[PDB]
Amino acid sequence: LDQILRATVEEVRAFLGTDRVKVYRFDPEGHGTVVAEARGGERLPSLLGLTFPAGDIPEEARRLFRLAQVRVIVDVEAQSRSISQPESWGLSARVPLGEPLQRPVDPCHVHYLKSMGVASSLVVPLMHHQELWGLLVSHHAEPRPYSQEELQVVQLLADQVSIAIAQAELSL
Ligand SMILES: *[C@@H](C)[C@H]1/C(=C/c2[nH]c(/C=C3N=C(/C=C4\NC(=O)C(CC)=C4C)C(C)=C\3CCC(=O)O)c(CCC(=O)O)c2C)NC(=O)[C@@H]1C
């Protein structure tokens, strides 16, 4: 899979022409690693082989990817801020998403991206069945809204990729 996932990121970037796009594999201990990444004009350094700390994503946000499978970051210019709430109570996957066309990320995450030279990035999850295997994400150094039609291409492409993770898994 590590090999296939590598080629998958090469085709993805092409379709989305995104400067940088990487695949994120989720481990059972919460830790994840980068097994796929592509850079345009060496503009963005390589992070391949680097391990990211799960602490980067508590759990509430991670659930949304498995519950509603929908999350995107708007132009850091719009300064969108996110925060926790006492109401909590997450919504099941049985009921409709009922979420805004956009998702704000707390300031602590805003800078994290800014420090990465990212302004607007789309986060498409890679899952199979009821479990989550990994997470996909595209980085754009410029504002660019998404369309329902174009959204499917990528949103679907990811689903087609997540499916590869499942079928290929049987191999190993
Ligand atoms: C600050 C106090 C906390 C923190 C920030 C933080 N990050 C998220 C969520 C995400 N962060 C990323 C980052 C990445 N993009 C990549 O390309 C990669 C490697 C391939 C990473 C790791 C992503 C994709 C997410 C998920 C999207 C989302 O916004 O949920 C959060 C959660 C958001 C929230 O607060 O609701 C936070 C807080 N990092 C820390 O260590 C602190 C805990």
Which residues neighbour 34 within 8 Å (Cβ) at sequence distance 6 or greater? Answer: 22, 23, 24, 25, 47, 48, 49, 50, 52
Question: Does residue 56 have a known ligand-binding role?
Answer: yes
| CB of 81 shorter than 6 A to ligand 1 | no
Is 75 flagged in the annotation as binding? no
Q: Is the CB of 5 under 6 A from ligand 1?
A: no
Measured distance CA(76)–CA(73) in Å, rounded: 8
| CA-to-CA separations, 112 to 69, 105, 133, in angstroms, rounded | 22, 10, 24
* Three-class DSSP category at 142: coil
Sign of CA dihedral 161, 75, 27, 84: negative
Record the tokens describing residue 145, joined without a space: 């809204």
For residue 27, the Cα-to-chain-centroid distance in whole angstroms is 15
The token pair at 150 is 């174009």
9 ligand 1 Cβ < 6 A: no
Find the 61 Cα to ligand 1 centroid distance in Å: 8
Residues in Cβ contact with 121 at an 8 Å cutoff, skipping those fewer than 6 apart: 72, 73, 113, 137, 138, 139, 140
Q: Of 31, 85, 87, nearest to 57 (Cα)?
A: 31
Q: Which amino acid is at 166?
A: A
Contacts of 18 (CB under 8 A, 6+ apart): 12, 138, 139, 140
Instruction: Give the CA distances from residue 71 to residues 44, 123, 129, 169, in Å, rounded to whole numbers and listed in that order.
Output: 23, 6, 19, 26
Report the chain's terminal Cα–Cα distance, integer Å: 8
Residue from 110, 115, 64, 108 nearest 90 by CA: 64
> Are 139 and 44 contacting, i.e. CB atoms less than 8 angstroms apart?
yes
**1-172 under CATH 3.30.450.40, yes or no:** yes
Ligand 1 pocket check: which of 105, 114, 115, 138 to mutate, most ligand atoms within 8 Å of Cβ?
105
Please name the method used to determine this structure.
NMR
Query: What torsion do the CA atoms of 151, 54, 131, 90 make, to the nearest 10 degrees?
Result: -80
Asked whether residue 81 is marked as a ligand-binding residue, the answer is yes
